[PDB]
Design a protein around this ligand. Sequence first.
Ligand code: DTP
Ligand code: CA
Ligand code: CA
Length: 341
Amino acid sequence: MIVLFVDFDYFYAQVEEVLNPSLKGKPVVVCVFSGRFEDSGAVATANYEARKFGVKAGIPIVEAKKILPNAVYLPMRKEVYQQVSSRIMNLLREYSEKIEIASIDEAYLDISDKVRDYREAYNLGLEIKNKILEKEKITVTVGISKNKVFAKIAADMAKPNGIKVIDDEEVKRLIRELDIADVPGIGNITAEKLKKLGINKLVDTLSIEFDKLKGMIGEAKAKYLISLARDEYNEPIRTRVRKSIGRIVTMKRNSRNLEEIKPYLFRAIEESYYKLDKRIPKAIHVVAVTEDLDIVSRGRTFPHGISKETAYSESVKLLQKILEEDERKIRRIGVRFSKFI
DNA sequence: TGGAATCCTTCCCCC
DNA sequence: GGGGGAAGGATTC
Ligand SMILES: Nc1ncnc2c1ncn2[C@H]1C[C@H](O)[C@@H](COP(=O)(O)OP(=O)(O)OP(=O)(O)O)O1
Ligand SMILES: [Ca+2]
Ligand SMILES: [Ca+2]
């Protein structure tokens, strides 16, 4: 099996660059302004000229501004990047039918049939990078290996504007060599839990009683890691299905007054129902980010779909449960819909 | 900030 | 005991 993975370089900033080419060469910061004070919000992403000074996804816009007061700061336009995304995904379909769209900027391809080895794959690699650059003026990084996980690791190593092959000899090398934190699916919380068990490299996973692993990081993530370390990971490329739709918004001020929270909640419902587009959910969840940035949710599944009218009334009940059961103020409020007919 | 998948624990109903 | 589904969270990208 041969998997080819594509990650679109600094994606939101690059689209902004493409749509306004004068940006190129400058540091560009795509921001999610939250509207509480001037420059409240976070950075969605930044191009490389900004990242090399620490300006990156996650940091507050006020912090980015302190480091690069003269960078170019743009509000995020998700819809635009999304439409550009779709176009690029279409290009890749013309290279394989088996395609796993992982994110707005990530896709895996099963090119087992279309190619014979890591020479030919490298070429198809370049064919694709070039086609996407030609048709869309967008640079991407390509990772190629024996399974998804490694395909992605290859890309991470080779970015930006790279293309990289992790063969079999390297796979075996990285199983011993690679820091387990750099393995997809392993965040700060799992990486620290693995340190406490002495797992610092993928191979260490074999020096443990399976139940102690399951006991710590959970069963599924334990099997994941073990199969990887055993050169045995082999999950297939599959169409991912939209299972949930929603939208959460930031309120100007933290609050506990019901009538103060409702309009944000209603706006959240509205945007969500538009996004549904002929989809009909039987589940609603009201989600709230408390003032200490903790996340509380109350929900309900119906035996039928939910009309906009029903969602309005039910969301207020769930919002009321939340207030009744959590004493903190609400920072962010919103909804998810799920269990589509 | 923020969308959404996947997972995990718990509770519950009931053969 | 365990299938089976909900609910509320935890974790990740
Ligand atoms: N923490 C975040 N907050 C908001 N949006 C994000 C965040 N991280 C990523 N995104 C968005 C914007 C990104 O361009 C896009 C893809 O993320 P990602 O693949 O990790 O990096 P990137 O596209 O910005 O470039 P690169 O992979 O070269 O670092 O999704
Ligand atoms: Ca990318
Ligand atoms: Ca990591």
